[PDB]
Amino acid sequence: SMLPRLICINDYEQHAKSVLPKSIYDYYRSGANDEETLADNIAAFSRWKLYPRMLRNVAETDLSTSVLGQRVSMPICVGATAMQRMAHVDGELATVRACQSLGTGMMLSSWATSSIEEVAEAGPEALRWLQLYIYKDREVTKKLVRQAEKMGYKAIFVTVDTPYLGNRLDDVRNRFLAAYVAKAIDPSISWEDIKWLRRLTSLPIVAKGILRGDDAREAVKHGLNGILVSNHGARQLDGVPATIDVLPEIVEAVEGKVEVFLDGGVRKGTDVLKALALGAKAVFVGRPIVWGLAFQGEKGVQDVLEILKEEFRLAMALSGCQNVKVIDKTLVRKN
Amino acid sequence: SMLPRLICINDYEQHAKSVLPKSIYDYYRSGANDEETLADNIAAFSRWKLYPRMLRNVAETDLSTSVLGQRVSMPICVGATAMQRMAHVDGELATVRACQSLGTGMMLSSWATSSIEEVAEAGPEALRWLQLYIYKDREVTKKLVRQAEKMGYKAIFVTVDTPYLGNRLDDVRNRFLAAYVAKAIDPSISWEDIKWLRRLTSLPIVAKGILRGDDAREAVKHGLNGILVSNHGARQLDGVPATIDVLPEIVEAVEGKVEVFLDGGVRKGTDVLKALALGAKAVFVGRPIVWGLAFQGEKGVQDVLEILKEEFRLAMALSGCQNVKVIDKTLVRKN
Amino acid sequence: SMLPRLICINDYEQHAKSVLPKSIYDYYRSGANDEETLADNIAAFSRWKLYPRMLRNVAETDLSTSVLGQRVSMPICVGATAMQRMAHVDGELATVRACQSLGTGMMLSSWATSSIEEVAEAGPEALRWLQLYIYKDREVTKKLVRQAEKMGYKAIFVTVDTPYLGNRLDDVRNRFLAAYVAKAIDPSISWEDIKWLRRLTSLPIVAKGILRGDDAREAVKHGLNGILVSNHGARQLDGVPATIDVLPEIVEAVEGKVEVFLDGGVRKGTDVLKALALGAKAVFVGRPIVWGLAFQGEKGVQDVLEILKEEFRLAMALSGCQNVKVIDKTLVRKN
Amino acid sequence: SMLPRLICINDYEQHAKSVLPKSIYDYYRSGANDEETLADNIAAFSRWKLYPRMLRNVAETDLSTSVLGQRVSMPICVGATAMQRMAHVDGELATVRACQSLGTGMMLSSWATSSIEEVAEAGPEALRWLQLYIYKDREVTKKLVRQAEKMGYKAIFVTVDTPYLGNRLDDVRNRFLAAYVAKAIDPSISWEDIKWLRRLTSLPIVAKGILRGDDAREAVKHGLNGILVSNHGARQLDGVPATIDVLPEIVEAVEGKVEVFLDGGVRKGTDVLKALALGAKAVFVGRPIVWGLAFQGEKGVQDVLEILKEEFRLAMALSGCQNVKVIDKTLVRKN
Ligand SMILES: Cc1cc2nc3c(=O)[nH]c(=O)nc-3n(C[C@H](O)[C@H](O)[C@H](O)COP(=O)(O)O)c2cc1C
Ligand SMILES: Cc1cc2nc3c(=O)[nH]c(=O)nc-3n(C[C@H](O)[C@H](O)[C@H](O)COP(=O)(O)O)c2cc1C
Ligand SMILES: Cc1cc2nc3c(=O)[nH]c(=O)nc-3n(C[C@H](O)[C@H](O)[C@H](O)COP(=O)(O)O)c2cc1C
Ligand SMILES: Cc1cc2nc3c(=O)[nH]c(=O)nc-3n(C[C@H](O)[C@H](O)[C@H](O)COP(=O)(O)O)c2cc1C
Ligand SMILES: CCCCCCCCCCCCSc1[nH]nnc1C(=O)O
């Protein structure tokens, strides 16, 4: 295969560090402040131990599932990551092409270096969603939703954990965004604006960035269709729990009323299994996709997605699960 | 800005290590004995995880609060640190000037390299308090209180955790204070002397150095106006808990009868948020102020205070808090 | 003695790393994926603390016990490890000869580089068992059992945790087995095939690879004679618990109906004591045997087994135990 | 003072490593096997946190206490360490002279490089006890007790955790004792031999090496006068708990019927405070005494003892304790 030989997600990061300008690599890697939550997003997955069932017959595995009523090849989807064209010339076009190939969904950043329309045209058969920021300018906010609707996108992920940008130390050091966001994004965002957004579109809406059970229930009350349990990849408020650690309480709080997803520190097939065992319908990957792009554009993303798929297929088979329906809560226990 | 580029409190320490004579840097940095509590003052903050509320509207933040009935710009104040003129020529004059600029309070060491009067004259509009040791000589002890009263200081912080000085290994190695304190400070100090001090002055009095809930309640009983939960920056008895870990029990013990403050290991805006979520009215910083002074005197202190302010403003906004009144206990949970 | 001087199991590994080609050493050492469980198999033993009884009279120790009704010199036996002829020319013949000398049992891999018959002929007086994989080809599966029966083997250990091979990163890097196993081993294996196997042979059957209490009880229900609590030396599903940590729950689940064994991270006499105190009849060693072989073939295996025996004899005597019958559960408590 | 400048117990060890032949340093330093308990004897003290009382009046401290009815200057005494003449020419004579100077007790090894009589003559006013092994030869065992009685020793510490010597890896590597002990010490030792010993002498008898509450109570039943909670400095059975962690359960089990002491990992004044807060009458130091000897014979031991005394005096004063009677259990809580 392609050289150098990369066989797990960490290899992709290690490769990306070797080829990317420091300030770009740093921008992608960084967490907020002392990066306590960034270390924890990963370490937390390790604390959840797996309890595999044997002798279940795993000759045939079917990794397919559904996200907000749309079928996907696997419970592993591409999360929004700004400015993908810094990692590769093809940026978000490469990403959507790979998602089309794999049969999974792509969440498009509002801060994409490719337009809603262009992404639809590169991947017309891909499952596509828009990640939306509520800008101070509600007119452009509305325009984005309408372009998403018109261009055949299938949900809006409204990010609710970024009234201001987090403080990522390397970005400041590298004189690299916090000021631009403060100029553009509306920090006044409340549940009122979520009601506005719910009236504006009939598309499925997911609140991205929920970490509390009470906010989750509030999301349900406002007719939202899903919760993405996210600490924004540990890039916003540092010292928040790992997403894997809060997921079960969010899942409990929501009472099956709404689909619950996770992102933050997914690197391996076992991370995927553990999230699903805890009640997540699907997970999203942020950084691994950028590492994929940095390695080989479309094929790199495809590689990263296929590593995650097959790692997940194996962990599923080793744990006695033929498909996602048979993943249950007795599969996991925290140490 | 000023070079080298320092953007968080740790940078200031790293700079101070590079420019200060070893024995001075060491004197400032050191904890007691094996520095177990010194590591814990910091590590403990990391264990307390934040549970941010989303969609609260944080377009306007007001960090102002009040300490012992006096208004301050932020719940972040300067704690007493002896011999500031070793870090910078302007020492405590630079410090009070910065506190005046920021609108926060300065706690003046009894072991200041500037007099009560001089500090009042450098920062006549600054909120100023005296940190008092009860010397064997009660006449000078009384003189200090009377000078503080006459010079427009607004409280006495009586330090109660230093009957003798702790054993800081580097100070001994560097042949650098323990003997001088044993000659000067009265180890016979009991609750009787606190009753004396309470009769001596009508100024607000805070017991600094309380780590036990029973002592806290005893402080309330003696008509004291506040508790500063402090292990003296881990420089007295090593192996005492981190201040953040004992705060909630002190807060509980006191039953809202008296204001409770914290110092010890505050380095970040999130440390400030976490202390307030646990019931502290305000925090004090010791070392970061000395690092500030070592970098650029007044402006350095101002920089350190402004880093803490804005870090705190951000952590507040990211956690859904517009002001300090809405900080509550559901914001935190220990891991 | 023989040089270099090796006096504990870790020395043997350190020696084997120095003399074996990297890809062979790596093949032997590796765990699955990030090797979380591989670190835990060992670290977990360290968390279980010993509570030795004094003054019991340990002048005479008898380490003998019985496995599936057959007497052994010690509760320490050789687990199946594929392709031993990579470590030494004599491979499995050297291993069985050493087991014969020591009076303990050898578990023979289905993937041995020596035949069932040859191993019987090298060690005709050795206690010998067959580790069986259920191949897609049930005819060869049956042939192996029949050769084991005919050649005087005394049990079948059916491995139930390998429907597919785990992903061992170094093997992939070194272009070293996963594909060959997927071609050969039947992933469709269920409890039905265990019923088949139970009808096929009157030999004692042990399910190897059980990690769950419910599977353990299911094993009992199917007339199996033992459980080998195993995570396949952390080489299958990564993130499963250490075997020492799940043993007590398996032991409880089984209600003394069946003998329970452990493998995974046994390196020391105290590991052996701790497993027995938790309810294991006997332990199996995988890697230490390969390290032994790499050092000096038969004598190396003999050395490793004798280190384990005597380490175990000492830990037994120091803990007040004259024989295995007096090992009890009050001997251990987890920290 | 004397050079190099050593100001805490760790400095003494660091000095001893620099001047002692490796095999001698190693012999002294080593724990058993992987030295898990050796690390834990120390780390465990760190987990017990101190809760100092303020404002108690600590102008006068009295560190004096009593051990088995005999007064000592401090609750810090010298434990038995074999072959002290390897660290210094004066060996046990230097040690007893220092104990005489300080007014504390010396526990003399049965494996001393100085005789019972000679030690009595070097330190005729020192508080002296004999550490006794029950040799296979009961005639010499009895002779030692009778010489101790005749020479004015005031207790027998019978070591009950060494039926065989532990396996200390460096000793084996360095070809350095296990065989000699197996030839000399009786592994058949039971409670019967303790009854024998109790009939043999009217001297106070302490069982040294108890780690279990049931053995402790058995010790009480046999008319023993004290328990020394000891894991033999982590040199016997590895993986036993730290002595500080089991002390409170031993203390509880004994119901104040008998005095309870601790050794194992005492390096600091706070270690002493923490042991007493948990119920120990006194602690014993092993290794620090050998480090003292290696530095400067008698004066070195004196220095180490005085460091421990004054460290303890300070920790006592900082925690609000004027004497040992006022040390209580609310002073400590495990983290
Ligand atoms: C380089 C980068 C850029 C990101 N840009 C966005 C964005 O534009 N919009 C958004 O909602 N989240 C953004 N996020 C957060 C991700 O959507 C997601 O929550 C996070 O990457 C998932 O964690 P993981 O990277 O550890 O997979 C970004 C994250 C990274 C790492
Ligand atoms: C260099 C230094 C000097 C100090 N001098 C005093 C003092 O004179 N009086 C006093 O009450 N506390 C003194 N303290 C303790 C501080 O008031 C405070 O409790 C501690 O610095 C806060 O912890 P932090 O440094 O980790 O912020 C000193 C602390 C340091 C680090
Ligand atoms: C190099 C190696 C080869 C192995 N081959 C087999 C095998 O052929 N069949 C099997 O059931 N288990 C196999 N195992 C797993 C072992 O039977 C056993 O569960 C594991 O080695 C015990 O753990 P330890 O190595 O840490 O002792 C193998 C393990 C290793 C390390
Ligand atoms: C070098 C050395 C020699 C020892 N020799 C004896 C001995 O002869 N008899 C005995 O009962 N204990 C012996 N011990 C154990 C000590 O009495 C004691 O339990 C241990 O040293 C205390 O732990 P610490 O060294 O960490 O202080 C020895 C310990 C060491 C470190
Ligand atoms: C091709 C024209 C450029 C399109 C506009 C892109 C501007 C993006 C600058 C603002 C920085 C966003 S960084 C961000 N937003 N949300 N999450 C993140 C993150 O870095 O985690």
Ligand SMILES: CCCCCCCCCCCCSc1[nH]nnc1C(=O)O
């Ligand atoms: C300008 C004339 C000098 C004024 C007197 C200063 C003497 C200070 C020497 C005593 C050392 C105090 S160090 C201290 N006190 N309290 N806390 C500390 C600390 O180092 O934490």
Ligand SMILES: CCCCCCCCCCCCSc1[nH]nnc1C(=O)O
């Ligand atoms: C002498 C002729 C060769 C006999 C057939 C040996 C083929 C073995 C190749 C398959 C790789 C097995 S590796 C394995 N199986 N079970 N556990 C393991 C392991 O590596 O843990």
Ligand SMILES: CCCCCCCCCCCCSc1[nH]nnc1C(=O)O
């Ligand atoms: C001057 C003549 C020599 C007197 C006899 C000394 C012999 C000692 C050799 C046996 C080794 C004892 S080491 C030991 N015993 N108990 N605890 C220990 C230890 O090393 O912890």
